[PDB]
Structures are given as C-alpha cells and as structure tokens.
Design a binder for this molecule. Structure first.
Ligand SMILES: *[C@@H]1O[C@H](CO)[C@@H](O[C@@H]2O[C@H](CO)[C@@H](O)[C@H](O)[C@H]2NC(C)=O)[C@H](O)[C@H]1NC(C)=O
Lengths: 132, 53
C-alpha cells in the first residue's frame, strides 16, 4: 500500500508564508517525480508545479501564474516533499494536493525484459489548504 | 609393526595431515554440488504471513 501523508495545512493570510508537505509511506522518493495541483473552491484543477527526482537532476517546472511565490523542494532523507509558499495573493485560496505516479515492473525472469507484470498507481495526498 | 624401543617427538597442532584432510573434505563437498540445480530463479520478493496451525 502507497500513501502520501500530507500535513502542514494552516490558517494564513496573503501577508505571510506557508509550507505544505507530504511524507511517503511504502513508496520512497529516491525515484519519485512529484507534483502539486490546487483546486480553489468552485474551480477545476490547476497545476502548480513539478519536481523531478534528484537522481535525474532535481529539475523543477512551475506554472507561470504561481511561479516564484510557490516553489518545490525535496528532503531526500525522510521522504518528504515540500511546497514553500511566500508573499501570496488573495487568488491563492485553494485546496492543495501532492501527487505522484507509482510504476512497478515485476519481471518474470532475470535473463530477458520481455515478459512482466506492469502496475500503475496514481497516489494523492488528502488535501491541505492555503487560506486568505 | 610395533617399533619396540623407539621414542618419537609427536606433535599435533603442526601435523599437516590435518590440513590435507581439511582441503580434501571441502573439495569433495564442493564436487558433490557440481551437477545440482542453482536456485537463482527463486531470488524474488516472497510475500509472507504466519502458519495456519
Ligand atoms: C499458506 O497459504 C495458502 C494460500 O496462499 C494456503 O492454501 C489454501 O488453503 C485453503 C484452505 O485449506 C484452500 O481452500 C486453498 O485452495 C489453498 N490454496 C492453495 C494455493 O493451495 C495454505 O494452507 C497456507 N499454509 C499454511 C501452513 O499456513
């Protein structure tokens, strides 16, 4: 079983800062690409940004309307993902979620990568908030 | 053939016969496994629970 254990939600104003985070359970982050998405009440899903595994460079990608004030980093010890937000807008009220794709390839043999069992799990945190 | 009036300085903890036998036995043991199945296809994740007894 794979879980993103999300925490750090709090009551904040735009004139402040907030760090939200997710600790993995079962799944580790040494090969985990991770992304934050937010949903304002009454709205659809807006991508915030993505961080690649540190083994692949640690490169990040951010969505223009949230760029700079919302950034993403990784712990690499206790499997924790962080979203650090500073100097926010009144438009940033939303439920934020952390998400990742879990790819499992269980091979039938150690001599050929032809026959195997491929399992794909979309794992989400519970949802935490940024308030105004 | 009892040697009668001979007195010889015996020593274990130097006797090389100990070493020869050690080599021999280890070697004979390894040879017996040469034609046997290698259990390498079985080095996989084994999901485990307690015995129902
Ligand atoms: C080990 O687990 C297996 C299941 O993975 C048990 O086997 C089943 O036992 C039930 C009850 O008798 C049968 O109806 C099933 O048909 C059995 N399945 C298979 C594949 O044989 C097994 O009894 C367990 N053994 C111990 C010692 O706990």
């Amino acid at each position: 079983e794979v879980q993103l254990v999300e925490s750090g939600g709090d009551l904040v104003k735009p004139g402040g800062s907030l760090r939200l985070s997710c600790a993995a359970s079962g799944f580790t982050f040494s090969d985990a690409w991770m992304s934050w998405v937010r949903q304002a009440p009454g709205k659809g899903l807006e991508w915030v940004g993505r961080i690649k595994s540190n083994i692949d460079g640690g490169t990040t990608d951010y969505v223009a309307p949230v760029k700079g004030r919302f950034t993403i980093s990784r712990d690499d010890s206790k499997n924790t993902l962080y979203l650090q937000m500073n100097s926010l807008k009144t438009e940033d009220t939303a439920v934020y979620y952390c998400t990742t794709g879990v790819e499992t390839y269980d091979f039938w043999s150690g001599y050929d990568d032809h026959y195997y069992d491929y399992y794909f799990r979309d794992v989400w945190g519970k949802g935490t908030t940024v308030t105004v | 053939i009892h040697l009668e009036n001979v007195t010889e300085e015996f020593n274990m903890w130097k006797n090389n016969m100990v070493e020869q036998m050690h080599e021999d036995i280890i070697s004979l043991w390894d040879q017996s496994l040469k034609p046997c199945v290698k259990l390498t296809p079985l080095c996989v994740t084994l999901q485990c629970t307690n015995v129902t007894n």
